[PDB]
Design a binder for this molecule. Structure first.
Ligand SMILES: CCCCCCCC/C=C\CCCCCCCC(=O)OC[C@H](O)CO
Ligand SMILES: CCCCCCCCCCCCCCC
Ligand SMILES: CCCCCCCCCCCCCCC
Ligand SMILES: CCCCCCCCCCCCCCC
Ligand SMILES: CCCCCCCCCCCCCCC
Ligand SMILES: CCCCCCCCCCCCCCC
Ligand SMILES: [Sr+2]
Ligand SMILES: [Sr+2]
Length: 296
């Protein structure tokens, strides 16, 4: 079983490495086609695509009477996106946020704060319905103020959409092969733990945003990474968390929310009055290191 474990594992890495690049390249071409910013395409299409794991994970979890996993995976991802994902990207490719995007990040902050307050008692199904609607409004609002759309409306768009979709299939399949392969090596060597078994799928639903952002960062597409991080967090709260609430009340996790809010606050302040580069990225990483060392 270890043999096909090494197979699934390494193959997933290869599918993640190349899949992320194509997904980045395809998204970048679509944004130029739609005459919107890389932030927009990252906050919308890329975000939703790379948040599909969390949506399906917590829908299944809350349905299988494990709402702790549900809210845990949604919140955990949000912290990982800002901490690890955005942390590495800011260092690789620093970014200066224009004021059209600062307004968008401020909305993100207000959104999270809202989610944190109504979640103090936990998350009812009504809460999910509310958060899901704001998710929809945000998407439409993000598209329309990031829209300088003009055209009228063949072969150059087809190659773009193909590159994007296949790139997305690459990272989604590549990420779950990574987890399947790691799990298979983990039980064949008999080193399985039921909570580490959660930690690999926890980290697994963040592999898309991680690899995708690393690809965009190395092509100086920080604005795309930024939109991807902002969009994924909302998609985690307004989508993954929300859907989980429909099946069952999610228990309150105020410690992680407080962490998320602070990191979200820091994110806005850095974007509004400073930059998102090295020492900001280093700070994010540091906070992420502390978080994974002390949280529960
Ligand atoms: C519209 C965008 C708002 C963005 C955020 C602005 C600041 C927070 C504003 C109201 C917080 C919620 C007030 C009502 C809930 C208070 C807390 C509570 O414990 O109850 C939650 C309630 O049960 C859940 O249905
Ligand atoms: C070494 C890890 C696996 C890499 C798989 C892709 C290798 C691509 C090498 C260059 C040529 C690609 C085909 C050109 C027709
Ligand atoms: C940061 C990633 C930590 C977990 C292992 C990734 C191996 C590739
Ligand atoms: C005040 C809450 C009362 C809840 C009573 C039991 C049924 C809850 C059903 C939630 C359905 C959510 C459907 C989302 C599509
Ligand atoms: C604020 C950044 C996260 C701090 C976590 C402290 C342990 C909980
Ligand atoms: C170590 C973390 C240093 C973080 C510095 C943040 C402010 C940079 C100047 C603005
Ligand atoms: Sr994700
Ligand atoms: Sr509530």
């Amino acid at each position: 079983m270890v043999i096909l474990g090494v197979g699934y594992f390494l193959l997933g890495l290869i599918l993640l490495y190349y899949g992320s690049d194509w997904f980045v390249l395809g998204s970048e071409r679509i944004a130029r086609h739609f005459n919107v910013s890389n932030f927009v395409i990252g906050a919308t299409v890329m975000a939703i695509g790379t948040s599909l794991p969390e949506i399906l994970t917590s829908a299944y979890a809350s349905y299988m009477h494990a709402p702790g996993i549900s809210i845990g995976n949604a919140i955990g991802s949000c912290i990982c996106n800002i901490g690890l994902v955005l942390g590495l990207s800011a260092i690789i490719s620093p970014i200066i946020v224009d004021k059209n995007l600062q307004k968008n990040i401020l909305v993100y902050l207000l959104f999270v704060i809202f989610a944190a307050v109504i979640g103090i008692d936990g998350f009812s199904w009504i809460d999910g319905v509310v958060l899901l609607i704001l998710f929809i409004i945000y998407l439409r609002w993000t598209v329309k103020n990031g829209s300088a759309e003009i055209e009228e409306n063949n072969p150059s768009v087809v190659f773009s959409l193909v590159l994007l979709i296949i790139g997305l299939i690459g990272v989604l399949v590549g990420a779950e092969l990574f987890v399947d392969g790691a799990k298979k090596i983990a039980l064949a060597l008999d080193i399985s733990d039921k909570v580490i078994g959660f930690t690999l799928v926890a980290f697994g639903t963040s592999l898309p945003e991680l690899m995708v952002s690393l690809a965009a960062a190395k092509r100086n597409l920080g604005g795309m990474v930024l939109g991807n991080v902002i969009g994924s967090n909302i998609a985690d709260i307004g989508g993954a968390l929300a859907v989980g609430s429909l099946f069952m009340h999610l228990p309150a996790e105020n410690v992680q929310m407080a962490v998320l809010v602070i990191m979200s606050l820091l994110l806005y302040l850095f974007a509004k009055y400073s930059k998102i580069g090295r020492w900001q990225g280093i700070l994010f990483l540091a906070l992420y290191i502390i978080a994974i060392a002390s949280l529960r």
